[PDB]
Design a protein around this ligand. Structure first.
Ligand SMILES: N=C(N)c1ccc(CNC(=O)[C@@H]2CCCN2C(=O)[C@H](N)C(c2ccccc2)c2ccccc2)cc1
Ligand code: NA
Ligand code: NA
Lengths: 10, 27, 250
């Protein structure tokens, strides 16, 4: 829930 | 070959803050 | 990790975070053992009592991390899984015996100041270092108590005598495990905890000044309880399986 978003590529 | 040697520590001959605690227990 | 401290930057550049894709959450710890192989605990991937059975496509490997939740742009590397290998005699039914699994990455990760593989022990380093009272180091982003850390946590813990390990639990202990932690009488504490699973217990060889992974965080009864100890998969004992897997599948 509090994990910053990872680049969509991954 | 280069395993277990940390760029920011062993490779620069710097010690982290508590590795000596480990060394001192290898009596 | 409970009763640990914040890691220094690049202190554990073999630390790997197992990260689930949806929902985006920490799954487990793991470790980098070469540019394409990651070592972890089998229960991180397969634990039927809890309905846990992950496949390659369900996760990512994040390497070079410090911050738990942040995306560490220009520092961490995120890798996809080509294939999971679990020990064929991993005993999830009883006691987590042979709690070990390998993951091959789709592509080699680039080493850097923050990404670097740890060594796996030879029989001689093992005999020399795996002695009651010798301390290893455990790292992870798991619970701080039996909340969660902002950054990687570290704790140094002494290996415990086998009779003491057995007498502390009702679980059947095997030669493929060891336990570590302080006794109540020793005035120091600290332990791994949930979320630390799969991460490495490492020792620095005094012979060649290289870090070796002696254990994998496997199981415990609560966390940092007085008179209880953390239990770790004995990496050297399962090395034959490790080499065979890498020798067979590159
Ligand atoms: N304090 C620690 N060092 C530590 C504690 C927990 C972990 C995460 N590992 C786990 O959670 C593993 C997965 C199956 C359940 N399990 C556990 O650690 C259990 N708490 C533990 C156990 C051990 C082996 C097999 C099944 C269950 C147990 C349960 C009941 C009575 C005695 C012992 C990792 C580290
Ligand atoms: Na017992
Ligand atoms: Na304890």
């Amino acid at each position: 829930g509090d994990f910053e978003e990872i680049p969509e590529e991954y | 070959a280069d395993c277990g040697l940390r760029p920011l520590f062993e490779k620069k001959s710097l010690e982290d803050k508590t590795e000596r605690e480990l060394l001192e227990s290898y009596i | 990790i409970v009763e640990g401290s914040d890691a220094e930057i690049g202190m554990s550049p073999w630390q790997v975070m197992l990260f689930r894709k949806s929902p985006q959450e920490l799954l487990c710890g793991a470790s980098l053992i070469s540019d394409r192989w990651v070592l972890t605990a089998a229960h991180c991937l397969l634990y039927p009592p809890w309905d846990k059975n992950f496949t390659e496509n369900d996760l990512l490997v994040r390497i070079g991390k410090h911050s738990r939740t942040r995306y560490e742009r220009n520092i961490e590397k995120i890798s996809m899984l080509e294939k999971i290998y679990i020990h064929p005699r991993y005993n999830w039914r009883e006691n987590l015996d042979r709690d070990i699994a390998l993951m091959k990455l789709k592509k080699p990760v680039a080493f850097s100041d923050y990404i670097h593989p740890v060594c796996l022990p030879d029989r001689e380093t093992a005999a020399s270092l795996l002695q009651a009272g010798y301390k290893g180091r455990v790292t992870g982003w798991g619970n701080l108590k039996e909340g969660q850390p902002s950054v990687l946590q570290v704790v140094n813990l002494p290996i415990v005598e086998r009779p003491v390990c057995k007498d502390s639990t009702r679980i059947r202990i095997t030669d493929n495990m060891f336990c570590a932690g302080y006794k109540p009488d020793e005035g120091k504490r600290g332990d791994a905890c949930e979320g630390d699973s799969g991460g490495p217990f490492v020792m620095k060889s005094p012979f060649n000044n290289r870090w070796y992974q002696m254990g994998i965080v496997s199981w415990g009864e609560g966390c940092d309880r007085d008179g209880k100890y953390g239990f770790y998969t004995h990496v050297f004992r399962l090395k034959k399986w490790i080499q065979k897997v890498i020798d067979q599948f590159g």
